[PDB]
Amino acid sequence: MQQVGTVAQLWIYPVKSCKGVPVSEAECTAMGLRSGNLRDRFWLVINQEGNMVTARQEPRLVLISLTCDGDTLTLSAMNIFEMLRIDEGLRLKIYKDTEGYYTIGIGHLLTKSPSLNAAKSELDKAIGRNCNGVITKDEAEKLFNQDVDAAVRGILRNAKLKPVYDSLDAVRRCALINMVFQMGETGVAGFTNSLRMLQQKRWDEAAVNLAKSRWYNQTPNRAKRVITTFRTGTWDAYTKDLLLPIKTPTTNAVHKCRVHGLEIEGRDCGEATAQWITSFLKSQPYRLVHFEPHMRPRRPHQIADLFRPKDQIAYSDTSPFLILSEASLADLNSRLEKKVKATNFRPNIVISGCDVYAEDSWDELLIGDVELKRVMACSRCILTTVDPDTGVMSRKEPLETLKSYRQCDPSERKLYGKSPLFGQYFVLENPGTIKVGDPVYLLG
Ligand SMILES: Nc1nc2c(c(=O)[nH]1)N[C@H]1C(S)=C(S)[C@@H](COP(=O)(O)O)O[C@H]1N2
Numbered sequence: 001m002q003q004v005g006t007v008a009q010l011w012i013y014p015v016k017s018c019k020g021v022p023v024s025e026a027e028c029t030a031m032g033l034r035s036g037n038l039r040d041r042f043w044l045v046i047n048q049e050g051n052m053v054t055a056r057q058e059p060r061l062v063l064i065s066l067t068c069d070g071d072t073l074t075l076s077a078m079n080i081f082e083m084l085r086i087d088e089g090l091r092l093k094i095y096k097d098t099e100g101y102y103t104i105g106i107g108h109l110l111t112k113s114p115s116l117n118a119a120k121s122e123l124d125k126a127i128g129r130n131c132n133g134v135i136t137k138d139e140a141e142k143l144f145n146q147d148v149d150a151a152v153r154g155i156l157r158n159a160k161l162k163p164v165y166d167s168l169d170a171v172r173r174c175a176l177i178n179m180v181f182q183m184g185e186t187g188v189a190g191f192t193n194s195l196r197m198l199q200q201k202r203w204d205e206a207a208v209n210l211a212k213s214r215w216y217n218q219t220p221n222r223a224k225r226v227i228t229t230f231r232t233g234t235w236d237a238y239t240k241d242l243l244l245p246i247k248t249p250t251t252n253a254v255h256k257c258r259v260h261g262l263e264i265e266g267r268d269c270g271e272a273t274a275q276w277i278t279s280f281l282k283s284q285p286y287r288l289v290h291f292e293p294h295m296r297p298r299r300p301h302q303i304a305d306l307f308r309p310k311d312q313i314a315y316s317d318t319s320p321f322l323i324l325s326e327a328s329l330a331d332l333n334s335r336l337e338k339k340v341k342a343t344n345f346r347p348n349i350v351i352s353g354c355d356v357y358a359e360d361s362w363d364e365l366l367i368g369d370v371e372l373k374r375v376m377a378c379s380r381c382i383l384t385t386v387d388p389d390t391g392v393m394s395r396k397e398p399l400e401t402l403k404s405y406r407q408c409d410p411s412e413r414k415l416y417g418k419s420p421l422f423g424q425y426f427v428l429e430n431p432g433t434i435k436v437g438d439p440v441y442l443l444g
């Protein structure tokens, strides 16, 4: 027909409320996207009562990734913020660091002055209120995000550190940011020989050389962790990744679970996964389960009667698919102080090349050989405020800004209430494969 956009991103969220997996191609099934062994919201974290655990309860779920390399599933939860939380700790009252300097939060230096008045003046300036030397964890995490971003910006402006940083893989980049956070750019830039070895990928030699430094002697247990990260390119010294086979043994228990009030089964993924998730979240005992295709699916028509009786989902909130356009996202962002990415809204298909909110009027789409049918708008909640990089829920933006201008028409206030609309729910009319780059055609 007529092209109305192009597929820009495809996202599968294998575990409900956890990190998305970007893909260049995906099968469109009646239940949602599939890439190999990963299917959209086919895994679920449950509590001891069998009830879902979502990012409304545990926003740090968004830090967990489940990925698949053909033969093996990997669970991982680490990134620079988590690495530095482990190494820097958390203190909500002004304290003195090991050099005697007034500090607060996650290693946030307030001043080198011996004056407590100066430390408290810096604190109140940085937080924007009269804290009397005490902050909340949310405030400590805000300062932390600022400090990490500043460390990275600084590395990228440093002619000695940028070439090494650019040369490093993602995990080893975190180890370099870690050192800069601890000791500052100039200190790290002084590690001339180790930095050369790192840029040359001489990992064992770099590790041997880094352990001879004053840094190692002053903080040997932290340095040992950072050095292991440089040596191996893994998270072995922090929350170590868990490697699992794709096939869960049928001797594992099947649990009766509850997702948004309705029952659905899942196969327990085993004690290793339960322990790993629970330890990372520091939570009550949780399990991971997986939906198997002989189990009874949940029925979107029971949730919202605009969906067809035949529609089926596993653990998704309501719909097999969520579609969003770049234009819609850019329009929201022009109204926000803190910019957001598509990840906050957890769409499966992001389309470029259209005007704002064009998807709201795309009733029937053809993408590749796949036909999709629009059902209703996606109404948003606090999950959009959960930050994908830090796992910290703002509980405010961007949901407030969306509340300001994206409420549903008065003619439509039975379905959505006052939850703002952002993105569109679609169902499958014809199975097939879609690819990033595919033109999107409006039918009819
Ligand atoms: N396929 C699909 N994507 C979706 C939805 C859905 O129902 N189906 N709900 C959206 C909304 S309103 C929420 S808050 C989050 C929930 O993501 P989760 O089910 O992984 O926790 O998915 C978003 N993307």
Ligand SMILES: [Cl-]
Residues within 6 Å of the ligand: 218, 219, 220, 221, 222, 223
């Ligand atoms: Cl130490």
